[PDB]
Amino acid sequence: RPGGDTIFGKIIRKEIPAKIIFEDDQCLAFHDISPQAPTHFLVIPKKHISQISAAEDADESLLGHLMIVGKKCAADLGLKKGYRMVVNEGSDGGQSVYHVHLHVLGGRQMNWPPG
């Protein structure tokens, strides 16, 4: 609209406040309001891609860019002992917002299975 019609679109357009960590021309990172670890933030693309299953071949760089920004923000937030990155797709994956988002969690030992 630009930014999509989900709550993420409101965050991107600054219609509703968020604890934004970093922002560039392609994405934005902000803290998850329901953290599952001491540090839990999300990196979302400004381009609205509803689900990872709908991403096209041309979205390759953009998707890779979310992971680069994620590792940079994780280092900046002091997650030197490690972290886990997660992308949820659909019902079975637990996707709650239909705008592609990358979860980054750390600050504690992450267990296995990953859910």
Residues that bind its own copies (CB under 8 A): 36-37, 52-53, 55, 57, 59-65, 67-68, 71, 74-75, 79, 81-95, 103, 105-115
95 Cβ partners below 8 Å, 6+ apart? 51, 88, 89
Among 32, 47, 55, 86, binds ligand RIB (CB under 6 A): 32
Secondary structure (3-state) at 78: coil
User: Tokens for 110?
Assistant: 């992450």
Fill in the DSSP letter of residue 58: G
Which residues are catalytically annotated? 101
Residue 84 binds which entry of its own copies, ligand RIB, none, with Cβ cut-offs from 5 to 8 Å by kind? its own copies
